[PDB]
Amino acid sequence: HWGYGKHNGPEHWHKDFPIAKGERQSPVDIDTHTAKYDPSLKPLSVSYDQATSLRILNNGHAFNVEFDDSQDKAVLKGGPLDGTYRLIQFHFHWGSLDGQGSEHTVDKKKYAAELHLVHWNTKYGDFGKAVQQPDGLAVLGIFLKVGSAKPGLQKVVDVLDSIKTKGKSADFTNFDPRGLLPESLDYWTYPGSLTTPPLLECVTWIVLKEPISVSSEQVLKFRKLNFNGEGEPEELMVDNWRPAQPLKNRQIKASFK
Ligand SMILES: On1cc(C(F)(F)F)ccc1=S
Numbered sequence: 001h002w003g004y005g006k007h008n009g010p011e012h013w014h015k016d017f018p019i020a021k022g023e024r025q026s027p028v029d030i031d032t033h034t035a036k037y038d039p040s041l042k043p044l045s046v047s048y049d050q051a052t053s054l055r056i057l058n059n060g061h062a063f064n065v066e067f068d069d070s071q072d073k074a075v076l077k078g079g080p081l082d083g084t085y086r087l088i089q090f091h092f093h094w095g096s097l098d099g100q101g102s103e104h105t106v107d108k109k110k111y112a113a114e115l116h117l118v119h120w121n122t123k124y125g126d127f128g129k130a131v132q133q134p135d136g137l138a139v140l141g142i143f144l145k146v147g148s149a150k151p152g153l154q155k156v157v158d159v160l161d162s163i164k165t166k167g168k169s170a171d172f173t174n175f176d177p178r179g180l181l182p183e184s185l186d187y188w189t190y191p192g193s194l195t196t197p198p199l200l201e202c203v204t205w206i207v208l209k210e211p212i213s214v215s216s217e218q219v220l221k222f223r224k225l226n227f228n229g230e231g232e233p234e235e236l237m238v239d240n241w242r243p244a245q246p247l248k249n250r251q252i253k254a255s256f257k
């Protein structure tokens, strides 16, 4: 099945998922000089005070921190969005080395990792119906650089030993995703896609300009996870990022001057 290796990595995905070579695929390189300021954009509204985390899951491609999305508890609105998007899960993409790992790049610069907070448009009722729509999702993307530790990340790093291999989950209640946000909500936005199969073109991407800093020890612990299941040859979960895809007929808009 798909993955990130030589034989089943991103350059292969198009054979099972032809939309891989579609018109609005993600990630992309953000050319900062050509992203135009759009003064009609709104401040993003991130309302996470009532977020209810439930569980953390190693799905064989990344780990997901899952939320109860049965009510309007943790929502994203404003910015480029019409309506209200509900948080369902977050996950990361990261490298085997600090020099790589993010999916979006900024003037071709790769960060050590990239956090994706996935939200679905509540007008569609649930996640599975939202991914049938071109405005079904909004993904808040936040870059990670290695430097100072991020205290708000440590509860995630500390649970990873309990979900080392594919298919493992752990209770993961009362985690506050506000602790993963940088100071500034200045962002770039463009229409794109999921960055793993099935690569659906549902996503309004909102990528924050300000990275968060995480420590070398925090990211080292992400790299001890495994893509394989228990009892299988160990294959470290590293380099689970898709490279930048052609921008095609898209414009990236900046919320800031
Ligand atoms: O790529 N991708 C995939 C998913 C899911 F959950 F549908 F698998 C959600 C968000 C993103 S970015």
Ligand SMILES: [Zn+2]
Pocket: 091, 092, 093, 116, 195
């Ligand atoms: Zn992702």
